[PDB]
Amino acid sequence: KHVVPNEVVVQRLFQVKGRR
Numbered sequence: 001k002h003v004v005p006n007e008v009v010v011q012r013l014f015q016v017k018g019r020r
Contacts, residue, residue: 001008
């Protein structure tokens with residue numbers, strides 16, 4: 001999801017690790 005300013009990467013890891 002774009003790979004310029006590194007934001008949907010830390011969050012995405014939090015979303016996957018806290019549901020199912």
